[PDB]
Design a protein around this ligand. Structure first.
Ligand SMILES: COc1cccc(CN2C[C@@H](C(=O)N[C@@H](Cc3ccccc3)[C@H](O)CNCc3cccc(N(C)C)c3)NC2=O)c1
Ligand SMILES: [Cl-]
Ligand SMILES: [Cl-]
Ligand SMILES: [Cl-]
Ligand SMILES: [Cl-]
Ligand SMILES: [Cl-]
Length: 379
């Protein structure tokens, strides 16, 4: 088995807070575009018409292999939205596996709060499941096509590396790079194939249990989404966590506006008091019954740096109304394997994650845990 994907390592770039993107080409001849890797979506969409924030776009009339599906589509995100027309064309991933597949493409022609100013990406690659793709489930997502058409295993892995202003990382398509992690890989089942839904069974702050019905941890749902920057948490859980994180960091008090992400905090260049902030742990349901494992992040993860003579950051743990979102603040600590064939998601300490001399993120297990099925929410 291949354990070294030399060509795919370091194929991701991005700017802090604006997502990670991979270079792709569409059309004949190939048109190069930077695409946002978003495991919280299932639509492959690219800018397909002029827009001030786009350095370049997809020109359908210049592609021989272009085909119009003669159908429209729009997609509402959390705050940004776009509208386009469906079609298909050949697509590639230069620094990915050497193959060219035909996939569905939403040519974006109208958008709002979508493309960012100077983001450097021009499209979005939703890697989730068909179940949530617009217009409806019959529009086969990109990864699904790539799989049926080539001999690439049904699985991709992601190592997102923060920093402390250009992020990086690698998206290994079809396999697992042993160079990207240390220790062992722990798997949590994928509850349902729509978003990448998992189940959190216990939460800890510097070792101290949050002590809540574990149903509150997955209230609505919990998903791994590289398309979200923060560690979004349900209203009730978010409340408990900030109280705890505040008690733990009490050596220094901060304006209520910090804990709300509204305002950032600063410290003399390189004197950030990391040690005063607690570590955060999430126990995920493991594969064997009554077994769970633990993933732990550091302030370096949830205190996202933001562009003086100081190092400033903003709190990256926000409240959410739609369940828990394990955003980049979570992901950046691990090498995350989206083993789709075996309906599970693996976590391992990331070999690039940002940390100081004394602490490191971690993944430990197993922990004898009972009654985990009831940690999941149902309609
Ligand atoms: C990817 O990192 C980022 C890049 C730019 C901006 C941001 C900030 N915001 C955007 C925001 C947000 O809208 N995130 C979605 C991806 C995205 C990024 C930037 C612009 C537009 C869309 C992500 O897919 C959300 N997943 C849950 C979700 C919500 C609503 C609808 C769906 N569907 C239809 C399946 C799915 N998440 C953020 O954290 C993050
Ligand atoms: Cl090897
Ligand atoms: Cl390779
Ligand atoms: Cl269609
Ligand atoms: Cl729009
Ligand atoms: Cl420190």
């Amino acid at each position: 088995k291949k354990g070294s994907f030399v060509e795919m390592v370091d194929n991701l770039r991005g700017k802090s807070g604006q997502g990670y993107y991979v270079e792709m080409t569409v059309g004949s001849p190939p048109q190069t575009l930077n695409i946002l890797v978003d495991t919280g979506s299932s639509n492959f969409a690219v800018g397909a018409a002029p827009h001030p924030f786009l350095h370049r776009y997809y020109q359908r009339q210049l592609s021989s292999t272009y085909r119009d599906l003669r159908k429209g589509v729009y997609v509402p995100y959390t705050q940004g939205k776009w509208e386009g027309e469906l079609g298909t064309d050949l697509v590639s991933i230069p620094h990915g596996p050497n193959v060219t597949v035909r996939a569905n493409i939403a040519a974006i022609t109208e958008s709002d709060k979508f493309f960012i100013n100077g983001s450097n990406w021009e499209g979005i690659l939703g890697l989730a499941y068909a179940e949530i793709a617009r217009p409806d489930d019959s529009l086969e997502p990109f990864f699904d096509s790539l799989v049926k058409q080539t001999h690439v295993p049904n699985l991709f892995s992601l190592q997102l590396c923060g920093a402390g202003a250009s992020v990086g990382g690698s998206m290994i398509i079809g396999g697992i790079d042993h160079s990207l992690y240390t220790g062992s890989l722990w798997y949590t089942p994928i509850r349902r194939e729509w978003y990448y839904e998992v189940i959190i069974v216990r939460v800890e702050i510097n070792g101290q249990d949050l002590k809540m019905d574990c149903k509150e941890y997955n209230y609505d749902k919990s998903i791994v989404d590289s398309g979200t920057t923060n560690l979004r948490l349900p209203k009730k859980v978010f409340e408990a966590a900030v109280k705890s994180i505040k008690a733990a960091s009490s050596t220094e008090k901060f304006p209520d506006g910090f804990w709300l992400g509204e305002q950032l905090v600063c410290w003399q260049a390189g004197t950030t008091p990391w040690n005063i902030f607690p570590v955060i742990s999430l126990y995920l349901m493991g594969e064997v019954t009554n077994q769970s494992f633990r993933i732990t992040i550091l302030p370096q993860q949830y205190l996202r740096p933001v562009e003086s003579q100081d190092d400033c950051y903003k709190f990256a743990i926000s409240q959410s109304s739609t369940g828990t979102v394990m955003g980049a603040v979570i992901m950046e600590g691990f090498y995350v394997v989206f083993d789709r064939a075996r309906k599970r998601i693996g976590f391992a300490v990331s070999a690039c994650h940002v940390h100081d001399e004394f602490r490191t993120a971690a993944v430990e297990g197993p922990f004898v845990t009972l009654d985990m099925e009831d940690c999941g929410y149902n309609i």
